[PDB]
Amino acid sequence: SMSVKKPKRDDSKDLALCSMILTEMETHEDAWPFLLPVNLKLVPGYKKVIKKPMDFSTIREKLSSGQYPNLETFALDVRLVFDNCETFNEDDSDIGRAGHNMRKYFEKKWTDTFK
Ligand SMILES: CNC(=O)c1cnn(C)c1Cl
């Protein structure tokens, strides 16, 4: 509260660290469904069903241009990608499997880097 501060968690390296995690996810061999925005004109259902589309290249642009106020807003966009994937894809499909695999991969890097 007013004039009562908890001690300052050092966040000075967060941009660099998030950029590294994003780079590792971009180069993962199962990242191919997630590299570019889904084509809303060519994929039936996607525009109507998926209210907030998200992908790694959009996350990369937003990170490079100061559009993430903090750590957590970045992690929310990464998870949005995999949450969208689960909504639209069967668990037993290539894209669906890629999604579960990438989420697991991300969450471990996230824990090891920041927790
Ligand atoms: C991330 N992409 C998807 O979820 C998807 C599912 N089917 N198609 C054609 C696409 Cl593109």
d(CA 27, CA 86): 21
Decide whether any atom of ligand 1 lies within 6 Å of the 33 Cβ. yes
d(CA 28, CA 32): 8
Atom of ligand 1 nearest to the CA of 34: 1
d(CA 39, CA 2): 48
Spatial CA neighbour of 75 closest among 31, 33, 17: 17
d(CA 25, CA 78): 10
d(CA 115, CA 112): 6
Decide whether any atom of ligand 1 lies within 6 Å of the 15 Cβ. no
40 alpha-carbon distance from chain centroid? 19
Centre of ligand 1 from the C-alpha of residue 11, in Å: 35
Quote the DSSP letter at residue 14.
H
Documented resolution in Å: 2.1
Nearest CA to ligand 1 atom 9: 43
Q: What is the CATH code for 1-115?
A: 1.20.920.10
